[PDB]
Design an enzyme around this catalytic site. Structure first.
Site, PDB file in Angstrom:
ATOM      1  CE1 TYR A  26     -93.183  37.605   2.314  1.00 47.64           C
ATOM      2  CE2 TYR A  26     -94.690  37.194   0.722  1.00 47.64           C
ATOM      3  CZ  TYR A  26     -93.387  36.958   1.073  1.00 47.64           C
ATOM      4  OH  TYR A  26     -92.367  36.808   0.211  1.00 47.64           O
ATOM      5  CG  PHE A  36     -99.282  36.033  -6.118  1.00 46.54           C
ATOM      6  CD1 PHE A  36    -100.593  36.334  -5.701  1.00 46.54           C
ATOM      7  CD2 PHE A  36     -98.203  37.151  -5.919  1.00 46.54           C
ATOM      8  CE1 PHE A  36    -100.865  37.833  -5.215  1.00 46.54           C
ATOM      9  CE2 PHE A  36     -98.418  38.076  -5.025  1.00 46.54           C
ATOM     10  CZ  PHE A  36     -99.759  38.561  -4.815  1.00 46.54           C
ATOM     11  CG  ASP A  37     -94.757  35.795  -2.413  1.00 52.09           C
ATOM     12  OD1 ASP A  37     -94.145  34.805  -1.971  1.00 52.09           O
ATOM     13  OD2 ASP A  37     -94.090  36.902  -2.462  1.00 52.09           O
ATOM     14  CB  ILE A  56     -95.065  46.699  -3.811  1.00 52.73           C
ATOM     15  CG1 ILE A  56     -95.912  45.952  -2.824  1.00 52.73           C
ATOM     16  CG2 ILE A  56     -94.400  45.679  -4.913  1.00 52.73           C
ATOM     17  CD1 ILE A  56     -97.092  45.197  -3.559  1.00 52.73           C
ATOM     18  CE1 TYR A  82     -93.963  44.376  -9.317  1.00 57.97           C
ATOM     19  CE2 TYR A  82     -95.556  43.451  -7.468  1.00 57.97           C
ATOM     20  CZ  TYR A  82     -94.302  43.575  -8.034  1.00 57.97           C
ATOM     21  OH  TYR A  82     -93.041  43.231  -7.202  1.00 57.97           O
ATOM     22  CG  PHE A  99    -100.502  41.329   0.111  1.00 56.15           C
ATOM     23  CD1 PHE A  99     -99.657  40.316  -0.352  1.00 56.15           C
ATOM     24  CD2 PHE A  99    -100.820  42.395  -0.762  1.00 56.15           C
ATOM     25  CE1 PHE A  99     -99.035  40.695  -1.726  1.00 56.15           C
ATOM     26  CE2 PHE A  99    -100.131  42.639  -1.765  1.00 56.15           C
ATOM     27  CZ  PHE A  99     -99.311  41.712  -2.310  1.00 56.15           C
TER      28      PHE A  99
END
Length: 107
Positions: A26, A36-37, A56, A82, A99
């Site tokens: 991912y 962010f990731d 999630i 979130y 994503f």
């Protein structure tokens, strides 16, 4: 709401089922924001199973809607990831999530 926009290649038939541990490269993205990731950075391709609500809700539905070798493009609504709470310091409240997801799994 999960909206798949697929980069084509793969097989299109091997869909994830219950009790199956699948492997995903991912790479997250914030709408009008930076990264962010990423699983590409650690190079540990995030082994996880299906149906235990570990991930999630937006990432969970898009995982089953892919197949082997494919490359989708998620778009997660705020109410599934979130958007009420927000992850502290990392995810703001009322956030729309993007994503880059590749499904190179087993099982």
């Amino acid at each position: 709401g999960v909206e798949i926009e697929t980069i084509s290649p793969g097989d299109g038939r091997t869909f994830p089922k219950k009790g199956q541990t699948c492997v995903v490269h991912y790479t997250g993205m914030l709408q009008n924001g930076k990264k962010f990731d990423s699983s590409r950075d650690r190079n540990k391709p995030f082994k996880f199973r299906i149906g235990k609500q570990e991930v999630i809700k937006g990432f969970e539905e898009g995982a089953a809607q892919m197949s082997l070798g494919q490359r989708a493009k998620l778009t997660c609504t705020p109410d599934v990831a979130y958007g009420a709470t927000g992850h502290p310091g990392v995810i703001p409240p009322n956030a729309t999530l993007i994503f880059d997801v590749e499904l190179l799994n087993l099982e």
